[PDB]
Automatic annotation (TrEMBL), chain C:
Belongs to the parvoviridae capsid protein family. It comes from the Viruses. The chain holds residues 632 to 736 of 736 of the full protein. This is Capsid protein VP1. It comes from Adeno-associated virus 9. It is found in: Virion.
Length: 518, 98, 105
């Protein structure tokens, strides 16, 4: 429109209908100039990397991008509490995104002092990768998302991508992408940008915990009509071999026939938070479970959805089997256990195997009069018919969605870090300040200009997402477990600001508090 | 044009942590947990949503004959599956990088 | 009825809240996840208008003698009551109630 007219209003609210909840969040953003308007080839050689497992090749772009792939970007703690305490499931339906109130500033430095002024004629470029023609980086748990607290002003992260690499070198199959080779809208201070997105059909997330275990689905009062081999010898010596059979009933539930079995496994090492119970050696990387791709080892992290620990074993965790969040103010490198928040998936112990245990035991030989029957620990077990399992729970500060890789085949493409897997997720939204050259020389020079006016941009961003709800219809008589704040007095209110205005999330919040039968 | 282990942004850290140390660096009674941010400097430990497909390991043969063992290992060394007591060569088997 | 005087309402005039939108200063050229703490120093000014319609209850007294009325005092003074001083300072010299007219009990 014009310089003196706002191009949008501040929309931040949650609307709770019967089967739907609409979340709207608005944030103020700041966008600097990245790479001084240049594309730069990057690799482990440029960053000084040495290990083969961490070698990479890619490019850093002068473009930024908007990321809102975390639940706290849309749900307040109270809204999250309502969702998790009142619904058996939820899923995103549609998306509305807006950029408005664009403000481009120029910075001039004379001598140790910088002056900031408006540049009303400068432009900012925005476009969406609706055709998914660029590498998708929103599927990784990267920082730079919209802040959970609406009053926080955030910096737009720089967009970068990786391609095929051989050490620090590239190959002929490696791809280079120029983001200026895409049509993009150019916005001055009076212009705004908006688009709508429809989520593809995804299953409802399981925001419930099973009230039954897979091995306890039988009637505890009635025998089965099936038999089991109870004895093989002749009880109370030589030549004592005689078959025996008994009815599988309530007294021996472990041997009853069952139609379904727990889901797959890939065993993790077990770590205690009581440090003196751990071995006196360096076992992080060495002791960890991993997978290999083209000679590179990548940590199995977080891996298959598996129960974090056995009942009562709360002190133990799988070495890389769980999402680890950092508390407010936590450092980047080598922080103590009290500075991080270790999530756990104990709710899925009713259907999923324990991460630090074998799947089970399997026969490994043919027993005879000369050879005793032998069994072997199944340390990893693939998908088998009749298996059932629960996916990893999602969290308030955890990811929402991920892009399913474009491959010939996949199985249960639920993101392993939690969330909704989609072939066509919300498109990447890329933003960049248009370069403004400084005064050029009065004589023609064919070289590209390298002198630009120092600029940055700021504005507001709004994203509205409609969520579909799956209401609970339980006939359970006793009250359910519910997420609740603790009344006991404390220096600060949980999920609030401190005396210095710092917002903090004191704990990870899952979604599985209500219960339903298996 | 991309590998499954290199789908992240090479410029931005993850908001997830990893256990970097277990002992007490530089002796007895030196056990102490540690955590670090998974970022571009350590891509191998970053959290990932998808993992490579299934496997059934094959024996490795060189076309440089002097790099192979001096023994008869075709049938014996081969991967196989069994059906009703009959062994059938795993050939070509699961789609795996050569 | 409010004990300090006035009209008690379940739904009084709503609170009107106003704030200057923060305008960040120049951010660093390398991404940092922390919230921005460098802002351009700003303030805002403008005009505000409020219009209120009041309903009146007229007096229908049959009282014969004149009523008590609030009135200014004619006697000379250095300043006019409810006016500005020589330095332009406006002052309210006394509290003024509302109960001067009379009616039967």
């Amino acid at each position: 429109d014009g310089v003196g007219s706002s191009s949008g209003n501040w929309h931040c609210d949650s609307q709770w209908l019967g089967d739907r909840v609409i979340t709207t969040s608005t944030r103020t953003w700041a966008l600097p100039t990245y790479n001084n308007h240049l594309y730069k080839q990057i690799s482990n050689s440029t960053s000084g990397g040495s290990s083969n497992d961490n070698a990479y090749f890619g490019y850093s772009t002068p473009w930024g991008y908007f990321d809102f792939n975390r639940f706290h970007c849309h749900f307040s703690p109270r809204d999250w509490q309502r969702l998790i305490n009142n619904n058996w499931g939820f899923r995103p339906k549609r998306l509305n995104f807006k950029l408005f109130n664009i403000q481009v500033k120029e910075v001039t430095d004379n001598n140790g002092v910088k002056t900031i002024a408006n540049n009303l004629t400068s432009t900012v470029q925005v476009f969406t990768d609706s055709d998914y023609q660029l590498p998708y980086v929103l599927g990784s748990a990267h920082e730079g998302c919209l802040p959970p607290f609406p009053a926080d002003v955030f910096m737009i992260p720089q967009y970068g991508y990786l391609t095929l690499n051989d050490g620090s070198q590239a190959v002929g199959r490696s791809s280079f992408y120029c983001l200026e080779y895409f049509p993009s809208q150019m916005l001055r201070t009076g212009n705004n940008f908006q688009f709508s997105y429809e989520f593809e059909n995804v299953p409802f997330h399981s925001s419930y915990a099973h009230s039954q275990s897979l091995d306890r689905l039988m009637n505890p009062l009635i025998d089965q009509y099936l038999y089991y081999l109870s004895k093989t010898i002749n009880g109370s010596g030589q030549n004592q071999q005689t078959l025996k059979f008994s009815v599988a009933g309530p007294s021996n539930m472990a041997v009853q026939g069952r139609n379904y079995i727990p889901g797959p496994s890939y065993r993790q090492q077990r770590v205690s938070t009581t440090v003196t119970q751990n071995n006196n050696s360096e076992f992080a990387w060495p002791g960890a479970s991993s997978w290999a791709l083209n000679g590179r080892n990548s940590l199995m992290n977080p891996g298959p959805a598996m129960a974090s620990h056995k009942e009562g074993e709360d002190r133990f965790f799988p070495l890389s089997g769980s999402l680890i969040f950092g508390k407010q103010g936590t450092g980047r490198d080598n922080v103590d256990a009290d500075k991080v928040m270790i999530t756990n998936e104990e709710e899925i112990k009713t259907t999923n195997p324990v991460a630090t245990e074998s799947y089970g035991q399997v026969a490994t030989n043919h027993q005879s009069a000369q050879a005793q029957a032998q069994t072997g620990w199944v340390q990893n077990q693939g998908i088998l018919p009749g298996m059932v399992w629960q996916d990893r729970d999602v969290y308030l500060q955890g990811p929402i969605w991920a892009k399913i890789p474009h491959t010939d085949g996949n199985f249960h493409p639920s993101p392993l870090m939690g969330g909704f897997g989609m072939k066509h997720p919300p498109p990447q939204i890329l933003i960049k300040n248009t370069p403004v050259p400084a005064d050029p020389p009065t004589a023609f020079n064919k070289d590209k200009l390298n002198s630009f006016i120092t600029q940055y941009s700021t504005g507001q961003v709004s994203v509205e997402i409609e969520w579909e709800l799956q209401k609970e219809n339980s006939k359970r008589w006793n009250p359910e477990i519910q997420y609740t704040s603790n009344y006991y007095k404390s220096n600060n209110v949980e999920f609030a600001v401190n005396t210095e205005g710092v917002y903090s999330e004191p704990r990870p919040i899952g979604t599985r508090y209500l219960t339903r039968n298996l």
